Design a protein around this ligand. Structure first.
Ligand SMILES: *[C@@H]1O[C@H](CO)[C@@H](O[C@@H]2O[C@H](CO)[C@@H](O[C@@H]3O[C@H](CO[C@H]4O[C@H](CO[C@H]5O[C@H](CO)[C@@H](O)[C@H](O)[C@@H]5O)[C@@H](O)[C@H](O[C@H]5O[C@H](CO)[C@@H](O)[C@H](O)[C@@H]5O)[C@@H]4O)[C@@H](O)[C@H](O[C@H]4O[C@H](CO)[C@@H](O)[C@H](O)[C@@H]4O)[C@@H]3O)[C@H](O)[C@H]2NC(C)=O)[C@H](O)[C@H]1NC(C)=O
Ligand SMILES: *[C@@H]1O[C@H](CO)[C@@H](O[C@@H]2O[C@H](CO)[C@@H](O[C@@H]3O[C@H](CO)[C@@H](O)[C@H](O[C@H]4O[C@H](CO)[C@@H](O)[C@H](O)[C@@H]4O)[C@@H]3O)[C@H](O)[C@H]2NC(C)=O)[C@H](O)[C@H]1NC(C)=O
Ligand SMILES: *[C@@H]1O[C@H](CO)[C@@H](O[C@@H]2O[C@H](CO)[C@@H](O)[C@H](O)[C@H]2NC(C)=O)[C@H](O)[C@H]1NC(C)=O
Ligand SMILES: *[C@@H]1O[C@H](CO)[C@@H](O[C@@H]2O[C@H](CO)[C@@H](O)[C@H](O)[C@H]2NC(C)=O)[C@H](O)[C@H]1NC(C)=O
Ligand SMILES: OC[C@H]1O[C@@H](O)[C@H](O)[C@@H](O)[C@H]1O
Length: 417
């Protein structure tokens, strides 16, 4: 959705969220340190300007006088006070609620209280609302389910049918009229009336066919169930998103979930693949790890100027898309072996990404005639990882480590005859 200030949320949000770092165990200091570190590590200069509180910030036992109250032990100066400290640092503050009767962690949530919660958030100086999908009451349940492989039984190729899912929405069903759309729309409407602009991030896990109506409601929408810091989830989410890229443009981006850079058992190669594809798919990019514990190597990864410029491109709204699946036939839904060959235009040139989904070194070749928007010829090519000029190339071939991604920026045409 377009926001009144004409820029906030047009390109993917960039920041840091407490969830993958701390889950439910958060307090002010964790945000103050995250913020100090975003500034001092140069991440803010790179573009990461949201410090986002996720679940577990409020007094858990209920609303206090009709309002969600900050847990004052965790936030001794309140959300408003944190907001002031964060705003002073040149950052933005995100908070979290749920379109249900309690948050996913069981805290007070916003369904039916949108106008009061939106006013509190606005009055606190909150800039971003991640809005979750837990605890939807029976009366607010959707009639149908949408074909979401993360939740519903699928046949081969991630397909849904009536026989597998009796409640699958009939063809032509308008998801904008669903209860999910209403629940989210109600918070959209509530925020819109406040003077302080808050962007809405729709944490709906790819449910309710949010791809078709999300752009009328918020600036981003989760398109899958929660990421986990392993390769299985990286490929799971990559595969799901690869089929949903047509919903991604300015003001409205599929959210491939929070970054796991720094976390779990992802190797350096997997981490690169994960960040590069998240950036290229123009998901919001929300760091999800303790920045004090993050290696300078992962910090440099996050600051990749080319991946960020591409993600943040203000002329080209579409993301990089798969042009060739690779091991499988094009358009093959496959959780372990998603589309390998990706490209999209940008102001800086064409970004090309080649994901080695195999667990052994493989040679991957970017061939210009295969890439939409390119043609046979010679282009200047730059390695995105090293920033190295690779020269004027008729194609680009690399030995790509297991689970790694070769990433190049294809520049202006060169050396003709
Ligand atoms: C496994 O399931 C998958 C997922 O459902 C399914 O995938 C489809 O596969 C078929 C081929 O079998 C694809 O059909 C081809 O489409 C080619 C170009 O399509 C582009 O446009 C597609 C249609 O766009 C419409 O719909 C969208 C939303 O519905 C809407 O936003 C648009 O406005 C428009 O109305 C579009 O779906 C597709 O998007 C997919 O692909 C891009 C990557 O290109 C990706 O980024 C997206 O995320 C999404 O996955 C894309 O935008 C078309 O050129 C091609 O034509 C070939 O054959 C014809 C013969 O007529 C030749 O003329 C031509 O030269 C080509 O050789 C063909 O029609 C279809 O697009 C896939 N759908 C999706 C959603 O991915 C597989 O079929 C399943 N496999 C099995 C075994 O069943
Ligand atoms: C979600 O909703 C938003 C808001 O309505 C909507 O945003 C719009 O996106 C389009 C498509 O990217 C924007 O229009 C483009 O703007 C860029 C940069 O200014 C231009 O380069 C584009 O022009 C090219 O393409 C045109 C035809 O497609 C050609 O006329 C021209 O020659 C260029 O090649 C293009 O105009 C538009 O500005 C925004 N709207 C706003 C208000 O910002 C978005 O598309 C929605 N998402 C989806 C999936 O529909
Ligand atoms: C607010 O947050 C504080 C601090 O995290 C919580 O304090 C804990 O309270 C439980 C029982 O109430 C104890 O078991 C813990 O030892 C306390 N921890 C600390 C460090 O004080 C408190 O529960 C939260 N209150 C609400 C209502 O959300
Ligand atoms: C996902 O794609 C992978 C790669 O094509 C498939 O894995 C292959 O499966 C066939 C059948 O078992 C084997 O002959 C190959 O040895 C496998 N290749 C690799 C590299 O593992 C897998 O079958 C696909 N999954 C689904 C559900 O279709
Ligand atoms: O409990 C908080 C969590 O709730 C889940 O529903 C969500 O997908 C996660 O991103 C995290 O927000």
């Amino acid at each position: 959705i377009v926001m009144p200030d004409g820029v906030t949320g047009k390109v993917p949000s960039l920041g840091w969220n407490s969830w993958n770092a701390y889950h439910c165990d958060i307090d002010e200091s964790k945000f103050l340190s995250a913020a100090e570190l975003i500034v001092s590590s140069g991440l803010l200069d790179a573009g990461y300007n949201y410090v986002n509180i996720d679940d577990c910030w409020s007094m858990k036992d209920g609303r206090v006088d009709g309002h969600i109250a900050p847990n004052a032990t965790r936030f001794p100066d309140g959300i408003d006070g944190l907001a002031k400290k964060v705003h002073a640092l040149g950052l933005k503050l995100g908070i979290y609620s749920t379109a249900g009767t309690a948050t996913c962690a069981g805290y007070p949530a916003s369904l039916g209280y949108e106008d009061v919660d939106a006013a509190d958030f606005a009055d606190w100086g909150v800039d971003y609302l991640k809005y979750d999908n837990c605890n939807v009451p029976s009366d607010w349940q959707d009639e149908y389910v949408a074909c979401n492989p993360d939740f519903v039984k699928t046949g081969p190729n991630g397909t849904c049918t009536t026989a597998l899912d009796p409640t699958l929405a009939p063809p032509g069903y308008d998801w904008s009229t669903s209860k999910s759309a209403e629940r989210f729309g109600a918070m959209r409407n509530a925020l819109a009336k406040q003077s302080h602009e808050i962007v809405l991030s729709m944490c709906i896990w790819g449910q309710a066919d949010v791809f078709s109506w999300g752009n009328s409601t918020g600036i981003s929408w989760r398109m899958s169930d929660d990421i986990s810091p392993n390769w299985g989830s990286v490929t799971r989410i990559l595969n799901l998103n690869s089929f949903k890229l047509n919903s991604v443009d300015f003001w409205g981006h599929n959210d491939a979930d929070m970054l796991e850079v720094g976390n779990g058992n992802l190797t350096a190669a997997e981490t690169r693949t994960h960040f590069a594809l998240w950036a290229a798919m123009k998901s919001p990019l929300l760091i999800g790890t303790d920045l004090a514990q993050l290696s300078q190597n992962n910090i440099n990864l996050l600051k990749n100027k080319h991946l960020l410029a591409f993600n943040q491109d203000s002329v080209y709204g579409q993301p990089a898309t798969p042009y060739k699946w690779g091991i499988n036939p094009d358009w093959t839904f496959n959780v372990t072996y998603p589309a390998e060959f990706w490209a999209g235009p940008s102001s800086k040139g064409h970004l090309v990404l080649m994901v080695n989904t195999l667990d052994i070194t493989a040679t991957k070749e970017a061939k210009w005639n295969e890439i939409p928007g390119l043609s046979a010829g010679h282009y200047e090519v730059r390695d995105v990882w090293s920033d190295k000029d690779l020269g004027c190339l008729s194609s680009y071939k690399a030995a790509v480590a297991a689970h790694d991604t070769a990433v190049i920026l294809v520049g202006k045409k060169c050396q003709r005859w």
